[PDB]
Structure formats: C-alpha cells, structure tokens
Amino acid sequence: EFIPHIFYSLHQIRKDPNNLSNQLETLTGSIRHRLKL
C-alpha cells in the first residue's frame, strides 16, 4: 500500500513545515520512495 502513506506524509508536511530541514528531507525521500514503488 502506498496511498494512505502518501496521504499521511502529505499531511504532516502541510501541518508542520517548522520541522528542521532534516525531517523535511527525510520525509520527502520517503514520498519519493513510495511513488518510486
């Protein structure tokens, strides 16, 4: 399953941009992983 994970990661992006760049980069990498699969 990639759909709910994409949804959720999308929402903690749009909820907390104030996270340090580390979390943003890691989470974007996670979304790139899910759409790659």
Binding site: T28, I31, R32, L35
Partner: peptide, 27 residues
C-alpha cells in the same frame, strides 16, 4: 507494441504521469 498504446489511451495513466511530474516539481 500495441499494449503500451492501449495503456496510454486510458485517462488514469496520464493521471499518474502528471502526478509524478507534480511531485518532481515539488521535490
């Protein structure tokens, strides 16, 4: 060879395509 032509004919293929493009722009 006609398989990919049939696949490109249905809209949701284009949908996944520009969804990938939009995430590429976002990243």
């Amino acid at each position: 060879t006609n398989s990919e032509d049939k696949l490109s004919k249905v809209q949701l293929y284009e949908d996944l395509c520009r969804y990938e493009d939009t995430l590429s722009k976002l990243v």
